[PDB]
Amino acid sequence: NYAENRMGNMMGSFKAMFEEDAVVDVAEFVETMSLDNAIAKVRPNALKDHKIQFMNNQADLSALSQK
Amino acid sequence: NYAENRMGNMMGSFKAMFEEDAVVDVAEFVETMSLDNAIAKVRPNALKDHKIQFMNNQADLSALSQK
Amino acid sequence: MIEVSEVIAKVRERLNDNEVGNYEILDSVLVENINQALLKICLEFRLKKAITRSLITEEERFLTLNNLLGIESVKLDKKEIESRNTIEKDTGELELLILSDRISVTPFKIGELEVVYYTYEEIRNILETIKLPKICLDVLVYSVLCNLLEIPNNETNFSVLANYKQLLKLAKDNLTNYLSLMYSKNIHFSKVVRV
Amino acid sequence: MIEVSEVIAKVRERLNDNEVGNYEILDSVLVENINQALLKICLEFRLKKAITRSLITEEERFLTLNNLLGIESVKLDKKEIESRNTIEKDTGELELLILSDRISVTPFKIGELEVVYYTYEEIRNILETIKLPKICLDVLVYSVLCNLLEIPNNETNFSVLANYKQLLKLAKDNLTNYLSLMYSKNIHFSKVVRV
Amino acid sequence: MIEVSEVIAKVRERLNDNEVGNYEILDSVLVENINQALLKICLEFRLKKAITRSLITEEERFLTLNNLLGIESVKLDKKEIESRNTIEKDTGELELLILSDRISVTPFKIGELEVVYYTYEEIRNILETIKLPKICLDVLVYSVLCNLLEIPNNETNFSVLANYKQLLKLAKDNLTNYLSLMYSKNIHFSKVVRV
């Protein structure tokens, strides 16, 4: 049960380290980013500084499937 | 029993070397980082200096599975 | 709230023009440049949201707003208005007609308009006060200062402008930090996609 | 709305020609350059959409528009006109004939024309007013200023022109921000392809 | 606690303006710049958390805070308030209305507000005292000093500003070290994810 629910949480979701000055209304950004069709409008010059680091969530899908 | 519990500890958790000035409230950061959907807000200019080193935890999953 | 006096004083000091007698830059020029800076700041950061709920009939067909920057939601009798246009289409889907700070409905229908938009409240006097967070001070200076540095007073004015651009970028980062801390959710995890 | 006086004043200040007596650059030159800037700005951003709904018969065959930039939709008796041409084809498919600010229909048919196009409303006097959003001020200055910097007054005029080009690019970015906030949908997700 | 006298003395020494008679920089300017530095420092590091627990009724509808930086938790009768807005929505979900240092509830309901926020306690006199950890001294100097170095006293002021930026970064690192040692858990291992 733990492996099935954790694998259902791993896919279908994303994790990211934000800086505290990356974008205005970061909760709004992670609401529209959770969709599979995301049109997220950010502040200007927010794609060249890399203040958001999307971490790889599914580094453990295969091992949990085998277990 | 040791291999099963150590493999359950290896996946589902992360290890990292922190500097003592990497981020404010480092216990809070490792609480929100342990989730599989982590939105961790850090201090500004904390992604360009690399004061956090996430070490690879699962370098021993396959050998423990075979054993 | 920011007083105009302190913005003006900082700009005068930075331009090596902090002389009461001389004033090489007229105060009308500074107030116009501050209006321009307020324009750019309020547009980029969507600082001021305003709601207007009026009624349009066959007598008066247009809704005169003020210092319009953008419309983010329109309701007509609690019905969503979808598209925006400036052409006065005769018939078809129900669209919002924008006429350079005049708002109406394109295939006109009697009713009421509830419109959410953005505003300036620009200034006209040196003794006025800018109703903005104090954290917005440095972004007002460094943005109006880059507008004045490109007067050809010195042969090295553009490098100084380039330095002030980076300073302005840092000020905008601070402002974004403030805005996120104010008007954004305090969340630490995302939600799973539900389809 | 932008007054021409403030555009002119900013250009004069930037050119180190803010002297009432001298005026090394004649005001006719500035008004012509401002007309050129309005041309380029209204063409690139498609700022002004105009709709003209007239009737063409055998007596008068052409529709005289004004300050034409482009046609984006033509209807003839609520029938779409498809192709555009300037050659006066004798017969065949029904095409729109464009004759340098005169509009007709190529294999001529009696009827009416509903045409959507783009316009200048250029200026001719210093006391006039430009009916454009105030955010368009900096793009008018920095674009007309690059047109005048290339008079060979100084040996380092082209580097200054290059700096003003980047400033103009930033001004255009601001203008695009404004236009998207005004005349575009407030959406946050795409739609699935339906075939 | 930091006395303002020692911050002022260090800034005067660093600006080569440690002369009692002359004082090329007025003390009003220094106190305003110190207020700006306190703003930025308290915003970036969330130094000061304050709790206000008041009551809102139909007579007085707004809660006047002071030196607001951000809201991190709102309770209304021990009920979580979820969203934040500045538009005075008529009805719907229950949101927190922020009116530039005035707090209310958007679809208004009688009750009480327990709000956690952030504060300045800015200074106004040279003889005052800043209630901050002493480790925050160097970040106050190096941050207010970068605000004054960009007065065009010298042709090499911006390189000096760049050096002081790195010094400020190191000071902020020290401050983060202190804050983690104070207000953070003393842990050495993470917890396993429990889903």
Curated annotation (Swiss-Prot), chains A, B:
Q: How does it assemble?
A: Homododecamer.
What this protein is called in its record is: Portal protein
Its job: Forms the portal vertex of the capsid. This portal plays critical roles in head assembly, genome packaging, neck/tail attachment, and genome ejection. The portal protein multimerizes as a single ring-shaped homododecamer arranged around a central channel.
Mapped onto the parent protein, the portion here is: 269 to 335 of 602
The record's subcellular location field reads:
Virion
Transmembrane parts of this sequence: none
